[PDB]
Design a protein around this ligand. Structure first.
Ligand code: GTP
Length: 588
């Protein structure tokens, strides 16, 4: 019981309290917070957050917390992962790994790679790209002015000269999924930070500029490199391979802290593979740069300095390519050595998919489990320790939907024309989490021109999720005469629904059904964690109907269920899908 002149505060609570105070009342949390600089910004996306709160969705219950950027733990991070000797690896590992590479190399491109125009390096670049402990300017600023300094770096490197190489190590500030944790007792309030180790935004532009093709894997030369592959159509092509086996089994790759496991010889092996695709003139640039990465001096954000014995530095330009190639080769290596299947014969009995250290392969039940069992040991001595599990063997999948990749598994979808396909699935709880806390930082206070680009982006990815799909449609119904933001993953031109068709291949309205028992599972956590109420679904459905009832062409009617209830369809006008300020150019 609180005093009257104090109840006014209550008009502002928007979430249950988390203080867990025991002798002092803790009414609730407010919708806003305080900037690291004192300002008062929002926690979630307004439009989206509001719609979700309409139904019994409790934003405060979404498995999402921030990472601890404090130095105390930031150091505990370095000490717990990066502080390690290099993994002992069997002798011929790198010879036999190189051997496997040659069985997959394309002679057509051998020694054909060269430098690139500032005009393509500049394409899609994240300008606000870090600076480096001893560097004043960031990417963009370097691009604006010191563009010349970068050209001599390239020269000094091509000539294999002196270069004071070093990396800055800072804890990555970001919100992290804690779904698993909360699903079990551990109600963590925040999670350990990832240490980003990176070159100096000059040395970055220098390396990237000449090695654009390998790094940006334009001609994709890495077996099963799913890196430039949009996520919303990968399982369809993977379903193909699955269906091409008699008793298919999928085995996932689970290296514990990949980056932390790359050896010097691993880095050298990629150096070689790199020299295979680059013209002889650049081979010294590669040797010089590779030589430095074998032992890097690292300056932490607070001043400390450690001499890392070259593992991988997340901020290095060659992380995606390097890690991927190195991953496939090592997995291919392990597989063959476990089954006996000749290196050269891999593609005869197996199909592989890799994205960094993330990936899996598909083979017959026989070979597959022989690999999962003998792979633990073989990989371990190869220097890529697999996460220890109760099963004692690599994670095997006997069902297609049980295939996990890039934090997603295949969700079955039934189209109106009685055909099927699979989309990228994930626990709803998490989709909703990321959809509510993704705030774009084109710094801006965010529009409704950004929340639309986000909803559109989540539409392409999760149309198979009714709840999520409808939330998007509602957001997209707002302010029709205001184009979407380009600061989201994808954005659209013309009609959103028209655009959906553009990349998905089918129209939203043609989406007739979602695997019952798959969707069912992906919604289980929503209750365990009490994220929604037994009326949310109903409510969101009503929210939609309301809008699409009256005669007119409403973009909320592309949802079959809503359509049948309002009796109206939605006739799309053309639309086109596009990326925004990009990471790795997806080839849509
Ligand atoms: N196939 C595919 N995978 C992608 C794509 N974009 C990101 N991924 C992967 O998907 C995983 C999950 O990413 P998300 O949680 O959606 O996005 P995020 O930006 O990495 O995460 P937060 O910003 O912290 O919310 C990532 O770890 C990447 O491996 C894409 O276009 N295609």
């Amino acid at each position: 019981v609180i005093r009257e002149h104090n109840k006014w505060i209550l008009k502002k609570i928007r979430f249950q309290g988390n203080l867990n105070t025991k002798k002092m009342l803790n009414p609730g949390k407010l919708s806003e917070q305080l900037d690291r600089e004192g300002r008062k910004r929002n926690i979630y996306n307004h439009q989206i957050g509001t719609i979700m709160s309409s139904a019994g969705i409790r934003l405060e219950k979404l498995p999402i917390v921030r990472a601890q950027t404090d130095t105390k733990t930031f150091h505990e991070a370095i000490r717990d992962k990066i502080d390690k000797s290099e993994n002992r690896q069997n002798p011929e590992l790198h010879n036999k790994l190189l051997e496997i590479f040659h069985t997959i190399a394309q002679p057509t491109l051998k020694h054909t790679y060269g430098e690139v125009t500032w005009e393509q390096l500049e394409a899609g670049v994240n300008r606000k790209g870090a600076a480096g402990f001893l560097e004043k300017k960031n990417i963009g600023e370097v691009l604006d002015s010191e563009k010349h300094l970068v050209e001599q770096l390239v020269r000094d490197l091509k000539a294999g000269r002196k270069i004071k190489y070093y990396e800055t190590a800072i804890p990555k500030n970001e919100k992290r999924d804690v779904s698993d944790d909360w699903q079990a007792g551990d109600l963590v309030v925040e999670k350990r930070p990832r240490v980003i180790q990176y070159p100096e935004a000059k040395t970055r532009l220098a390396i990237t500029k000449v090695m654009y093709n390998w790094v940006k894997q334009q001609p994709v030369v890495i077996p099963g490199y799913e890196g430039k592959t949009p996520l919303f159509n990968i399982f369809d092509k993977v379903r193909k391979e699955w269906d091409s086996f008699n008793e298919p089994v999928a085995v996932s790759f689970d290296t514990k802290a990949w980056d932390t496991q790359v050896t010097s010889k691993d880095l050298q092996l990629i150096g070689e593979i790199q020299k295979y695709y680059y013209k002889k003139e650049w081979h010294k640039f590669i040797d010089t740069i590779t030589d430095h990465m074998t032992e890097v001096p690292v300056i932490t954000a607070d001043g400390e300095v450690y001499i890392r014995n070259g593992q991988r530095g997340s901020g290095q330009p060659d992380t995606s390519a390097g890690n991927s190639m190195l991953n496939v080769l090592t997995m291919m290596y392990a597989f063959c050595e476990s089954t006996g299947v000749p290196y050269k014969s891999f593609n005869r009995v197996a199909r592989i998919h890799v994205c960094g250290d993330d990936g899996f392969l598909i083979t017959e039940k026989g070979l597959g489990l022989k690999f999962a069992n003998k792979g633990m040991q073989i990989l371990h001595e190869a220097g890529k320790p697999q996460k220890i599990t109760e099963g004692e063997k690599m994670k095997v999948a006997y069902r297609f939907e049980d295939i996990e990749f890039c934090s997603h598994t295949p969700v079955p979808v039934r189209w109106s024309d009685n055909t099927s396909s699979h989309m990228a699935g994930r626990d709803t709880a998490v989709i909703l989490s990321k959809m509510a806390t993704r705030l774009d930082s084109s710094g801006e206070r965010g529009t409704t021109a950004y929340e639309k680009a986000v909803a559109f982006s989540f539409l392409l990815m999760y149309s198979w999720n009714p709840l999520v799909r409808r939330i998007c449609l509602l957001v997209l119904s707002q302010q029709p005469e205001t184009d979407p933001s380009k600061h989201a993953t994808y954005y659209y031109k013309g009609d959103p629904i028209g655009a959906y068709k553009d990349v998905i291949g089918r129209n939203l309205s043609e989406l007739k059904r979602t695997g019952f028992e798959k969707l069912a599972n992906l919604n289980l956590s929503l209750s365990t964690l009490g994220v929604w109420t037994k009326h949310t679904s109903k409510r969101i459905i009503q929210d939609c109907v309301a809008i699409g009832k009256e005669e007119g062409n409403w973009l909320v009617k592309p949802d079959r269920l809503i359509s049948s209830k309002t009796g109206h369809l939605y006739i799309p006008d053309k639309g086109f899908t596009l990326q925004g300020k990009h990471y790795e150019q997806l080839q849509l």
